[PDB]
Ligand binder design. Sequence first.
Ligand code: MOK
Lengths: 140, 141
Amino acid sequence: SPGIWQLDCTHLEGKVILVAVHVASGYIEAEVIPAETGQETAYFLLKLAGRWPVKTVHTDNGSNFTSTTVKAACDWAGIKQEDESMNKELKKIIGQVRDQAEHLKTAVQMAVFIHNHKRKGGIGGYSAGERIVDIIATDI
Amino acid sequence: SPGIWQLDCTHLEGKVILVAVHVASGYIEAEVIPAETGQETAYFLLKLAGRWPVKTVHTDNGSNFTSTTVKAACDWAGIKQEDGIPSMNKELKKIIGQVRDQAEHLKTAVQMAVFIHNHKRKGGIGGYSAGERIVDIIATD
Ligand SMILES: Cc1onc(-c2ccccc2)c1C(=O)O
């Protein structure tokens, strides 16, 4: 179902990685923020919804999700809030490349790239990035 | 032509907005950044290439694109950087004006403007938004 996302946090090197996964494709958007604040959550949600058709986000039940700024952002963007493997593996990929860049946020974006472009299976398979565009274009 | 994006910058309230426009559809991605440095630009392009299949980037050849760090990122990501190959900015700045008094900070209003731009139906009730066009242009199957 095309508008469904899951949003999770990962700590690492004492920073926070916000990860949104498109549930039906496995396609990932992620960013590193100083701290898991209401402000940063709202900002990330607004960004995600202006880039993809986001109907429903499933979250952990942290306090960042129920701030007034998050609620105003979700209200404005038409996002409905609700209450894992693609997250273990982003961490894995991050380990595979941690040592190609100085900074953690570069590594994180390299991992998102590698994840989203990686063909699954043999000749005839699709990457996550292909699945999401395909699912949305079919829906339209 | 589906893998081509045009990068431009626009300046507001003393801040820097970096804009990437998918030329065939008009879809945009945009971020407020501190200043147009080699690292911020390389970071922006790596985010973009991780999210859409970017073949080619046309730039304004600003000094941030001659940075060694940008070239290394484009090489890493497999992007052909085309410098100096010739206005979303005007449109975006006007959408920003319509939402500016809803956001405590410019950065928020920029993302609200990107949301409205990508969702806006173009060319009548039988139209399509930039968002629909891009997925339609990019989808392979
Ligand atoms: C309807 C519909 O279906 N998909 C999109 C869309 C929106 C933003 C990005 C990509 C697709 C969209 C829209 O509201 O423009």
